[PDB]
């Protein structure tokens, strides 16, 4: 069985462009795959958080992906800062990755016009730690959506790269994004992907959303000015329509059969709000179950983390080895 | 309770005078007035590329010269940066503190990328932040370096205050120890660039195993001016080459710079090389009769770094999980 690795940051509420990118595949490949999936709260702080949302938020994440059907009894679930191994690789990895390669990230410079006031060497190191959580342990797989790819590509050329120059120690991995679903934009901006971290809530959908504030959100979702109005997909001219339509359509697997409505973008997205809201209810009736466990939520971490580490510190040895290291007296 | 103080050397070679003027002395000097930890810093070596073998074996050979000099593992904590997770930990949690540009600043990223053009990487880039991890863990208050080390603890001052300026008094703030001569030992053959051990060049280093003959080579044909009469007069600006021997003759001798220069007058430099090459070789002789018993002895350098390691895992990891706790991660279920 091929090696399933993933992450996703505690940064705010997992949202319905988690699900449709990353969550939803992830829970589909937990039995054709050995999965493991991460919490990972050292990148998180790649961008200032408040100490106490953070906590809050690694462990809102973690009964959310309970919730989603992330199964701990199939699959390894853990937060990043539990396992020091991701740290060690992560340094060892800098030392093999060009400063250009990080430099010409789009992510970088993105979250750098973003946050101009704090422009860390974190945010710049991000793609090295996260080749550094993948890479430890031998991951063939790594299920994320589009924005990724590009850092998925320095991780598949660090692996490569370092076993050129010593031997078979890394598996190289391969992204699986998803053919719809992979970048939900934003509400208000339908130019600019969903993220969790956006100051402005009224651009995102998070999967612990009241039926009411679905609506309202919904409802005032950023449309075009056509006369007349129809659902027709064209992302360079109907971004907020497309986007609507990319959301119920991944949200219900169907295509151009939603795009013969031929009514009002007000029909749209009052069933697109009924049908998310619909998801979100069984969600919900779990995540509230599972995040007001908290032994269960120590469990799982402490399983989660041991297992996590019997992985990590055989590559991180191996890693170790061959770079020259002494190795640590027993 | 006495201060701490903590400093490293990186695994890249042969320990040079410059090294042993520059640190290596204070800290064996150091280590009854202060709780001294030391570390072989293997994880900032890589940042250069390696061969992996003579990784290995200069991992043994800084630690085996650590203890020649006189570094004391019944006074001192002595270990291997790599057998310390909290270090790379730490590092990482500390880049999420400091400025790209604070990086981009620093002499040392840009006088190494320009040596290494072909490998320009994150982690030469990102070197002067594992080095405040390696200091803050252990509380530290007071870095005893060289001068070329002067902007890079300059950093951890910055990052040590702007971390507790966000979350309360988790750090000491670290003082740097440069000594008033020796601090930056200069090539012998281009007297404009320090001593480094990774220099291609040997004969612009005197490495501290090195013989009496061959210091006295070494030193003869250390660079010059043409001044005829020869003056030796200390000018760094002007007189090199004769400056950089007069600063070496100094460190050892412990002699003033207007001590020397009337010492000199009237005389060449090859009386000035003449007393530089006995009185470095002089200062190396204890070590020398000592090192070879420290390097064959495989049982005391594991030992060594088993002990050291274990002694510097109980102060980093208090160090580290006040950091976690703070930053706002979810302790480790014990
Ligand atoms: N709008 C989106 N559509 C689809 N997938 C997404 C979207 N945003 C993020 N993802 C995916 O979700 C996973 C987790 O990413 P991440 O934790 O950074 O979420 P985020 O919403 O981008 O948060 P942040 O704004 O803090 O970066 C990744 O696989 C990422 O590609
Ligand atoms: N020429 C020098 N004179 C005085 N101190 C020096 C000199 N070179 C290095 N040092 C000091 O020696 C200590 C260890 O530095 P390090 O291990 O990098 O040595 P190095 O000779 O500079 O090697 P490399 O060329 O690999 O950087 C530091 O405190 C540094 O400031
Ligand atoms: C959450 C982040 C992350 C850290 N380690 C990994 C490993 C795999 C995928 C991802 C990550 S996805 C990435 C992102 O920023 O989207
Ligand atoms: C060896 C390097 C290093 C790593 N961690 C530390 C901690 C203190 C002093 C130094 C270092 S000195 C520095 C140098 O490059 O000179
Ligand atoms: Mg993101
Ligand atoms: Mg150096």
């Known amino acids: 069985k091929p090696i399933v690795f993933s992450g996703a940051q505690p940064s705010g509420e997992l949202t319905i462009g988690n699900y449709m990118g990353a969550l939803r595949q992830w829970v589909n490949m937990q039995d054709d795959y050995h999965c493991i999936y991460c919490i990972v709260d050292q990148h998180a702080i790649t961008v200032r958080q408040d100490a106490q949302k953070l906590r809050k938020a690694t462990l809102d994440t973690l009964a959310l992906y309970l919730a ?92 490569q790269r370092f076993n050129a120059l010593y031997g078979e120690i890394f598996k190289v991995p391969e992204p699986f994004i998803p053919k719809s679903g992979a970048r939900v934009m934003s509400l ?59 959301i119920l359509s991944a949200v219900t697997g169907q295509s151009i059969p939603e795009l013969e409505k031929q009514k ?38 402490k399983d989660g983390a041991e297992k996590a580490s019997a992985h990590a510190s055989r590559t991180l040895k191996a890693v170790y080895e061959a770079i020259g290291f002494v190795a640590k007296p027993h």
């Open 68 to 159: 989603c059907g992330i199964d701990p009894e199939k699959s390894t679930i853990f937060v990043q800062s539990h396992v020091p191994e991701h740290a060690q690789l992560g340094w060892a990895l800098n030392c093999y990755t060009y400063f250009g390669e990080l430099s010409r990230m789009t992510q970088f410079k993105d979250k750098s016009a973003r946050y101009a006031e704090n422009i860390n060497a974190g945010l710049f190191d991000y793609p090295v730690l996260m080749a550094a959580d993948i890479l430890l342990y031998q991951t063939n797989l790594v299920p994320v959506g589009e924005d990724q790819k590009q850092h998925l590509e320095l991780s598949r050329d660090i692996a």
């Open 188 to 246: 208000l901006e339908p130019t600019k992907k969903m993220s969790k971290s956006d100051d402005n809530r009224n651009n995102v959908i998070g999967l612990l959303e009241d039926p009411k504030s679905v609506v309202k959100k919904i409802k005032r979702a950023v449309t075009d000015s056509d006369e007349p109005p129809v659902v027709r997909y064209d992302v360079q001219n109907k971004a907020g329509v497309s986007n609507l339509l990319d």
């Open 264 to 301: 009002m973008y007000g029909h749209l997205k009052g069933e697109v709000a009924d049908a998310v809201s619909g998801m979100l209810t069984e969600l919900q009736e779990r995540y509230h179950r599972f995040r007001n466990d908290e032994a269960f939520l120590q469990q799982v971490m």
